């Protein structure tokens, strides 16, 4: 109310917050095939997560988890979880992580074909050991 708020407290409105609303969502199925727990955050390039995670890696190309900024998803050993994926914004330029892309992850301009740098990436994942 105001009469009830603690010292330094907040009076929060009611309306929920809506985030990532515009962005197209890809669901992938993720199995942890290692013996150790794996935890992945909101802004990590899902494509490039721990080799031991087995999922449709091609589908995670240019993608992140569609969760709250700063939060994470925990993949315990030998468990299966479905996760929502969304594309990165801005320029869709991804440098670093596991050095799988080190570039542009966008779709480009041709609907119903793949860019060759994507197929390169995907091939390279495969032979660096990134489970699909």
């Amino acid at each position: 109310s105001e009469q009830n708020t603690p010292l330094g407290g907040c009076i929060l409105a009611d309306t929920p917050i809506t985030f990532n609303e515009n962005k197209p969502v890809t669901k992938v199925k993720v199995r942890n095939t290692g013996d150790r727990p794996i935890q992945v955050g909101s802004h990590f390039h899902f494509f490039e997560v721990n080799r031991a995670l087995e999922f449709d890696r091609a589908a995670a190309y240019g993608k992140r988890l569609n969760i709250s900024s700063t939060t994470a998803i925990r993949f315990e050993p030998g468990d299966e979880t479905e996760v929502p994926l969304i594309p990165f914004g801005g320029k869709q330029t991804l440098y670093g992580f596991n050095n799988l892309v080190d570039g542009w992850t966008g779709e480009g301009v041709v609907p119903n074909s793949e860019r060759p740098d994507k197929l390169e990436a995907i091939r390279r994942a495969a032979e660096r050991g990134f489970k699909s």
């Binding site: 150790r36 935890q39 992945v40 997560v49 721990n50 080799r51 670093g96 992580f97 596991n98 050095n99």
Partner: protein
Amino acid sequence: PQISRQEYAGLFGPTTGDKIRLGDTNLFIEIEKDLRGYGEESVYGGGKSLRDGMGANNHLTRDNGVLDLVITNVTIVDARLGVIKADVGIRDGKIAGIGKSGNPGVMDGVTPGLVVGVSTDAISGEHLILTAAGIDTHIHLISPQQAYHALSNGVATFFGGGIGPTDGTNGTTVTPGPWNIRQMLRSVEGLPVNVGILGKGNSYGRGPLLEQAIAGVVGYKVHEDWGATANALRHSLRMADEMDIQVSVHTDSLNECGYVEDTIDAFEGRTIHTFHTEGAGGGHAPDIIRVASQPNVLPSSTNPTLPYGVNSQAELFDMIMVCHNLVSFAESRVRPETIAAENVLHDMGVISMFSSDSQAMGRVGENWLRVMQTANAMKASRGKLPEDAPGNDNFRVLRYVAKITINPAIAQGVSHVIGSVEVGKMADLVLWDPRFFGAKPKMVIKGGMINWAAMGDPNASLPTPQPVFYRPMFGAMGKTMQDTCVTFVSQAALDDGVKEKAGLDRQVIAVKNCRTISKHDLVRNDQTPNIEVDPETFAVKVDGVHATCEPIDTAAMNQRYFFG
């Protein structure tokens, strides 16, 4: 004539074969060698030997190599020299000699370079232990006051980073970017410890790394908090090799981009310093400890797990849960099995350095204390190391000492100037009373001047009257504090004129020899065994042998000595 040992000792302290108890521990050191003859013993006082024309030379000007300072009849505990009794001599803020001091006019057997003269002052080492000052490789620059807590436990060199109490500093040992670096270089001018600063390693091209290199860093710190990626590692190490600087790492605890094995592969056999190698302080869970098997890894532990005690699990649990404002991250982070294992591996010479992690889970004023505390808990549980000699604990003690002295130095490429009591080195020295060894020093000698000391009432008729508490001294004063302190930098920076550009009055010294080193170059801690960790029960096997010990109830050099 003939004199009894007991009478001799009382005059001059212990000689070859005599044994000294290090506090309230069960560690006993033994004097291996006596370098300062018999019958011509140099002591300062009224009616004594270091008087004009007698033990002291009275005709030689200083340019004849007469000393500026002499420390007499002292027991030297050093990881490279061992346990010896000698005179120690200082000239131009450097160690000129270890041997027999005096006047060659009237004395036989004066070590060259150890001529006492008109220029010479004196310290009476008879009942004292002399060490190299410690070096703390894992400093968070959260609070300037840490320096005082450090000097007060016998640490005089800081390696790390920060920019005061920012959230980034609270978590990592990073001084990010050329502006912040410059700022921080300038600030530390006000501190009575040596410093080298670490930079942010998490970068994709060379640009952002090179920047910081030239700005003056001695290293790059790769931290999870800013991304502990393969990318980070790879580019950091490649730059490092270019710049002759070090890389330190705090690995991915969440296993997000990989497991430990993948991290290892990111190192790409390149020299690296690994902080809190056990993992309680961060790292690939449960099994970051396996990096201690690799020849390219220079491993360190932070000091809150050493020694392993009965309250250790309770503490750590609760600490993370506040450190990270938080339970399956918790009980996976905090593993009794690996903590015990850390303790054992230390004793084996498999983890090569102690560190603090200052005000980011460890204790800046407890590195010398905890080292000794660990050695003593471990003697109790394990007995004598195989290489120990039956009557003494020298092998052991000396392993431990290497951990806070020479090994850190080597890791950060400063063993050429600091870390051991050896000829040609900066006199960064600590004096201890055996009774107080590790805990409470007498003094710190910082660039050849006493900078810090236990001092009582300045109004009193002596220096000893109560209250006795640690206080700055003249080396800690004025323009001398800068003159006597080093700011470590990159050769890149040195060559680019960092000293002028930044306007530093400190001594500015280039780090060197960081990238060609391996685990085997480390002193008394050069072991690379097979390490296995059980992903269920977190049990550690070292060459197939279960690595554990039981927690201590009672620590030595602890509640007896401290009000804290």
